[PDB]
Amino acid sequence: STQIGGMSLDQARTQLAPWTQRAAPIGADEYQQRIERARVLMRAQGVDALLIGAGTSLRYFSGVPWGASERLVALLLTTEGDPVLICPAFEEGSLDAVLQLPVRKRLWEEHEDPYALVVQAMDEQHAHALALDPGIAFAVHTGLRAHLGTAIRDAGAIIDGCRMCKSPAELALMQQACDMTLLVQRLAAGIAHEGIGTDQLVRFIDEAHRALGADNGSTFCIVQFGHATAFPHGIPGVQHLRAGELVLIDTGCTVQGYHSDITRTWIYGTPSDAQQRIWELELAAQAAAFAAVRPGVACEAVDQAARAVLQAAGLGPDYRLPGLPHRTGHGCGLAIHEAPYLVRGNRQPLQPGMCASNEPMIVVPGAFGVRLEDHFYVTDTGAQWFTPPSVAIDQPFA
Amino acid sequence: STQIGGMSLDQARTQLAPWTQRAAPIGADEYQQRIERARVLMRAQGVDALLIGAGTSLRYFSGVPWGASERLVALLLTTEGDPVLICPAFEEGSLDAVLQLPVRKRLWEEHEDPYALVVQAMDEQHAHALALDPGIAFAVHTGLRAHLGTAIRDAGAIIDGCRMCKSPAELALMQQACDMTLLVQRLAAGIAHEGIGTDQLVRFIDEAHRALGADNGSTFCIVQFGHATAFPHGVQHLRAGELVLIDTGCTVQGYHSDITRTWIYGTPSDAQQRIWELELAAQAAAFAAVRPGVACEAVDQAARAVLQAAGLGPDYRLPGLPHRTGHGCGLAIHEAPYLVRGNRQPLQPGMCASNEPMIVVPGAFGVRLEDHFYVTDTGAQWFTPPSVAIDQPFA
Numbered sequence: 001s002t003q004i005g006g007m008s009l010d011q012a013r014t015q016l017a018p019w020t021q022r023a024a025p026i027g028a029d030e031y032q033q034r035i036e037r038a039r040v041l042m043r044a045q046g047v048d049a050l051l052i053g054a055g056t057s058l059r060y061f062s063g064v065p066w067g068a069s070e071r072l073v074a075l076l077l078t079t080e081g082d083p084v085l086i087c088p089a090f091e092e093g094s095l096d097a098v099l100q101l102p103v104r105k106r107l108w109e110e111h112e113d114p115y116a117l118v119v120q121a122m123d124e125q126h127a128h129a130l131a132l133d134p135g136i137a138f139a140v141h142t143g144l145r146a147h148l149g150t151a152i153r154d155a156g157a158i159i160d161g162c163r164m165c166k167s168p169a170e171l172a173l174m175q176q177a178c179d180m181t182l183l184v185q186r187l188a189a190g191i192a193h194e195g196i197g198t199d200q201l202v203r204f205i206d207e208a209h210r211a212l213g214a215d216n217g218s219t220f221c222i223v224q225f226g227h228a229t230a231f232p233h234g235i236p237g238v239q240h241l242r243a244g245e246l247v248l249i250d251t252g253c254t255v256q257g258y259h260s261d262i263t264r265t266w267i268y269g270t271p272s273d274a275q276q277r278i279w280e281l282e283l284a285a286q287a288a289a290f291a292a293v294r295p296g297v298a299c300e301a302v303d304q305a306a307r308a309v310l311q312a313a314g315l316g317p318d319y320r321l322p323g324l325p326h327r328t329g330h331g332c333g334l335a336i337h338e339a340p341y342l343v344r345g346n347r348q349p350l351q352p353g354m355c356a357s358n359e360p361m362i363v364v365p366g367a368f369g370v371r372l373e374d375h376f377y378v379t380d381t382g383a384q385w386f387t388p389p390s391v392a393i394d395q396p397f398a
Numbered sequence: 399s400t401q402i403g404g405m406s407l408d409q410a411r412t413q414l415a416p417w418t419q420r421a422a423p424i425g426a427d428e429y430q431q432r433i434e435r436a437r438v439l440m441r442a443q444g445v446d447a448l449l450i451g452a453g454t455s456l457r458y459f460s461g462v463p464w465g466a467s468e469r470l471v472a473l474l475l476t477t478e479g480d481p482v483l484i485c486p487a488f489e490e491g492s493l494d495a496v497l498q499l500p501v502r503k504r505l506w507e508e509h510e511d512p513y514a515l516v517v518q519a520m521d522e523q524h525a526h527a528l529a530l531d532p533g534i535a536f537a538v539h540t541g542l543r544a545h546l547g548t549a550i551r552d553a554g555a556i557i558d559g560c561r562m563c564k565s566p567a568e569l570a571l572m573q574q575a576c577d578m579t580l581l582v583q584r585l586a587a588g589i590a591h592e593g594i595g596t597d598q599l600v601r602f603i604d605e606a607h608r609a610l611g612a613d614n615g616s617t618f619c620i621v622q623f624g625h626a627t628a629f630p631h632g633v634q635h636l637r638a639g640e641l642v643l644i645d646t647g648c649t650v651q652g653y654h655s656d657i658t659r660t661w662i663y664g665t666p667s668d669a670q671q672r673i674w675e676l677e678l679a680a681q682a683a684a685f686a687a688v689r690p691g692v693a694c695e696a697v698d699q700a701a702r703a704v705l706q707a708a709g710l711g712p713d714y715r716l717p718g719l720p721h722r723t724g725h726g727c728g729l730a731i732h733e734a735p736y737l738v739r740g741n742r743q744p745l746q747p748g749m750c751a752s753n754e755p756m757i758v759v760p761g762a763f764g765v766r767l768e769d770h771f772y773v774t775d776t777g778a779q780w781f782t783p784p785s786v787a788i789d790q791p792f793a
C-alpha cells in the first residue's frame with residue numbers, strides 16, 4: 001500500500017540532498033585504450049581512417065561533450081600518432097578545456113572548408129580508406145565528397161565494437177545515474193495524489209534529478225495515466241490522475257554523459273483483475289528475459305524468452321496485441337539507445353560488460369499498457385541488474 | 399538602471415499571465431503548400447524522390463514533432479500521390495495523434511528492414527533519383543545504399559528552398575515566441591540584484607516562459623556575469639560593476655525565439671561602455687545592410703566594417719568578432735541562411751535570421767546583442783527592437 005501517495009512536496013524535498021556516492025570520471029588512460037581498440041577494429045575492417053562527429057561517439061573517444069551542430073567538430077583517427085581534432089578556430093579555447101585525449105588540432109575559420117582539412121589530414125598519413133560515424137549528419141558525406149573520391153565505409157561496427165562492452169568505470173557512472181533516477185521514481189510515486197497533473201510529475205522529476213546532481217536534470221520524462229499507458233511512446237496532452245488508473249513513468253538522467261532509463265508502471269487506488277493479471281505477466285516476462293542472459297547467448301534469444309512467457313499466457317504470438325509490439329530492449333551507455341538491441345533477428349552474442357534495457361511492455365489495445373524497465377549488464381557468468389525489478393502492482397520498488 | 403534591478407519576484411509574477419495574443423497554428427492547407435513547393439524544387443533539380451528524416455524537417459512537412467532516434471521515421475515524397483510515411487508499426491497510434499498531412503503509412507516491424515520499404519515505394523512510382531535529407535544520420539545513407547545502385551543526392555537545396563522563406567503564419571508564430579521571450583528578458587533584468595545566482599536567473603527564465611505559455615519553458619538559457627561573458631562557449635553570483643549576458647528563447651508551435659541581452663549591473667567602465675556602444679553600432683549596420691538581393695556575406699561584412707573602422711579586428715581577430723554575424727532561424731534554432739563570409743546566398747523576402755555580431759575582449763568581457771529580423775520587400779523588420787544603452791536593455 002505504502003509507496004504510492006501520501007508524501008508531500010516538502011517531505012520529498014527532504015530526501016533530495018546532492019548525491020554523495022560519486023563515481024570517478026573516465027581517466028586519461030581509458031581514453032587511450034578506447035583509441036587503441038578502435039585501431040584494432042579499423043585494421044580488422046581494412047580501414048585506415050575513422051571520422052567521429054560531435055555527439056556521444058566524440059565524447060567517448062575524446063571527452064568533448066558538445067552536441068552536434070551545423071559546424072563540423074570531429075576527430076579523425078588514423079593508424080598512428082595523436083588523432084586530429086577538426087574544430088572551428090573561435091572554439092579553440094573551449095575545446096582545450098574539455099579535451100581528455102592529446103590531439104593535433106586543425107582549426108577552420110567560419111568561411112573555410114572543414115572537409116578539406118579532413119582530407120588533407122588523410123593525405124598526410126597516406127590514409128585512403130575512410131570510415132564515417134553513422135551518427136554524423138549526411139551533410140558530412142556531401143562535404144567529404146567534394147574532396148574524397150574513395151569509398152566511405154560506415155563506422156558502425158568499429159564504434160559498437162568499442163562502446164558495446166562497458167569498462168568498470170563506465171558501469172559505475174551508469175550505476176550512479178540509475179540509483180539517482182530510482183530514488184526520483186520512488187519519490188514521484190510518493191507525491192502522487194488524486195488530481196495531480198502529468199506535467200506536475202514531469203516538473204517534479206526534473207527538479208529532483210537536478211537537486212541530486214544529474215548533469216542536466218531529466219534527460220527525458222514520460223508520464224502517462226490510464227488509457228494513455230497503451231501507447232508505448234505516448235500521446236500529447238496533460239492528464240489528471242484518478243483512482244483506478246495505472247501510472248507509467250519513464251525517465252532518466254546522465255552522470256558524466258552515462259544514462260539511466262527506468263520505467264515504472266503502478267496502480268493508483270484499487271486495480272482491476274485485468275490490470276493485475278497483465279502487470280504480473282509483465283514482471284514475469286521481464287524475469288525470463290533476464291534469466292536468459294549470459295555470455296554467448298544471441299540477443300534475439302533474450303527477446304524470444306520474453307515472448308515465450310507472453311505466449312504461454314495466451315498473448316502474442318510475435319508482435320500481436322494484446323502482447324509485446326516492440327523489441328525487448330536496447331543497449332545503453334553514452335546514448336539512451338545504442339547497440340546491442342534485444343530484438344528478433346539480432347544474432348549478436350552477448351559479452352561481459354554489455355549493457356541493455358529489459359522492458360518487454362504489454363499493450364492491451366483500447367485499455368492500458370504495462371511497461372517495467374530496468375537495465376542490466378552482462379557478467380562473466382550471467383547478468384546483474386543495475387536496479388532491482390518491481391515487486392507488485394502496488395509495490396513499484398523492491 | 400530603472401530597467402535593471404528593483405523588481406520583486408512577485409512584481410515580476412504579476413506580468414506573467416498566459417499570453418493572450420496567440421498566433422494561429424499551421425493549418426492543413428499550408429502543409430500541402432510546403433509539399434507542393436518541395437515537388438517543384440525536386441523537378442527543378444531533376445530529383446524524383448525525397449526522403450526526410452524525423453526532426454525539424456519532418457515537422458515542417460508533416461507536423462510530426464519527434465526527435466530522430468535509431469529507428470527510421472521518415473517521409474518519402476515522390477512526384478505524385480500522397481507522401482509515404484515510413485514508421486515503426488508499434489508507434490502507429492502515437493503517429494496518428496500528431497500527423498497534420500495525409501500520408502500513406504508504410505509500417506515496419508522491429509526485425510524488418512525499413513530501408514527496403516523506402517526503395518519499394520520508390521520502385522512503385524518508378525523513382526530512381528533520390529535526394530536525402532542532409533540533416534539525417536549517415537546510417538540512413540548506409541541502409542539506403544544497401545538497396546540502391548543509383549546516386550543518393552543531398553536534399554539541402556530542396557529543403558532550404560522551402561524553409562528559408564517564412565509564410566505569414568510562420569512569421570506570426572516566431573513573433574509570438576519573440577514577444578514572450580523579450581518580456582522574460584526584461585523581467586529577468588528587473589529581478590536581478592547583488593548576489594543573485596546564474597542558476598536562479600535560469601530557473602526564473604524557465605518558470606516565466608512556462609507561465610506565458612511557451613511549448614516547453616525555456617528552449618535553452620545561457621546567463622554569464624563579468625569575465626565569463628568573454629568565454630561565450632564556457633554557477634556565479636552577481637557583483638556591482640559586472641556585465642550580465644543572457645541568451646534565451648522558447649518555442650511556440652515549434653517556432654523559435656533566440657534573444658541575447660547584455661547589460662551592466664552597477665557602474666560600467668569606459669572600456670565596457672565603448673565596446674557596448676560598438677556592439678549596438680555593428681548590429682545596426684548589419685541590419686541597415688538587409689534588403690532583397692543582398693548577399694548574406696555582405697551583412698556579416700557590414701558588422702565587421704564597423705568594428706574595423708573603430709580599430710578592432712580585422713577579420714576574426716580579437717578584440718573583435720571571432721565568428722559569423724548570425725544564423726537563419728525557424729523550426730531549428732540554427733538553419734539557413736547563415737550571415738557568414740563566403741555565403742553568396744541573396745537574401746529574399748520572408749527569410750529570418752539573427753543579428754548578433756558579438757564582440758569578445760579576451761580575458762576581460764564580451765558583449766552580445768542578439769535580435770532577429772525578417773526580410774521584407776524593401777528591407778528588413780526586427781522581430782524585437784534592439785537595445786538602447788548599456789543600462790537600457792529594452793527599447
Ligand SMILES: [Zn+2]
Binds near residue numbers: 250251261262263373
Ligand atoms: Zn525508458
Ligand SMILES: [Zn+2]
Binds near residue numbers: 359
Ligand atoms: Zn529504454
Ligand SMILES: [Zn+2]
Binds near residue numbers: 645646657768
Ligand atoms: Zn542566442
Ligand SMILES: [Zn+2]
Binds near residue numbers: 768
Ligand atoms: Zn542566435
